[PDB]
């Protein structure tokens, strides 16, 4: 029934926004600024992203602005007006120049 | 210096439009309708991604594919600027023999 | 869990092997030639089954250019090993350079 | 032209191995233990783990060493290869792209260079 699927790296534009729902669901949503094509260059790219649960709240605990991170989800549209936006299925911050300590839940 | 490469399996919205461009190169701009099956199966709602396809490419799609066709689509996500929108820079594509069948014809 | 999904984009190395079982499920079996011309070629197989099956053994032949994506998978030939497939959930002809007549069932 | 990147989400097998080569240039190999959770009747059933190995080289291998513990839970970009181990055998890797620790389990403290 056809789906998508999507993987990127990039930088979050800004630290996550943390907000709860009425379940008591804990929703981030964060933009990730990609730019295609280190050497030449691209055209920045902005993906909104939104990261459910636990997963959301580790990622708010976790990640500030700036932060490099490689993202993967479905694509899905936002609602005269449509966006595109990506339902993060899993996140983490690349190691490519920067190093983490770990911390397991 | 992220990136962004995605996959996706859809049916065309319409036939496919062929145009071009100052140089030459032939350009075609179509739709896919891609409905996710969720967890709950439950359906969920319509995904329409544009997509661009340049060159032979391009010129292949247009004589092959038409509207309402099941296909794969390989790419990259580009931001065309608005005052923006998300569209696929197809890398690849082709017609998922899912629920169908192809009679190949190399070049 | 885990995501174990890919795709990946090649020539058929032959005609695509069509096969039945007990049942009289179709079963196809088909390796995938892609070069990463910086190179050394990448030999995938995969294997498709019922209806897409017998399409795909309809429609391909050999040096064919294919779309395909699945699952890695990893199977027994344990001596003194394991080796990966893929799980094929869609695949097609690539219109990168050839045409099809579609004939939808 | 062919197209073989890769995305995978496992944990680490073992600790990152950390070895030099003939530059000085470093160089990392691991192993990605997933399991993929397939569905039939329905009702979840997870099935047979797959073990990938990953090369990561330079600076990115430096960090990964430094950051990954064994049975880290992973997100590998790359793409795969081939290389030659019946006595020559053939065995695909991924040269992994970019790597990093899922936050779906976990937190990190993240330190740029």
């Not at 981030?28 to 050497?39: I, K, L």
């Not at 991170?69 to 120049?97: C, F, H, M, W």
């Amino acid at each position: 029934a056809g789906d998508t699927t999507i993987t990127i790296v990039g930088n979050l534009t800004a630290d996550p926004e943390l907000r709860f729902t009425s379940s008591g669901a804990a929703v981030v949503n964060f933009t990730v600024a990609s730019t295609p094509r280190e050497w030449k260059d691209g055209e920045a790219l902005f993906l909104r992203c939104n990261i459910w649960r636990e997963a959301a709240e580790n990622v708010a605990e976790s990640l500030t602005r700036g932060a490099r991170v490689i993202v993967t989800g479905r694509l899905k549209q936002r609602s005269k007006r449509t966006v595109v936006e990506v339902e993060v299925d899993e996140i983490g911050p690349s190691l490519r120049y920067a190093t983490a300590k770990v911390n397991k839940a």
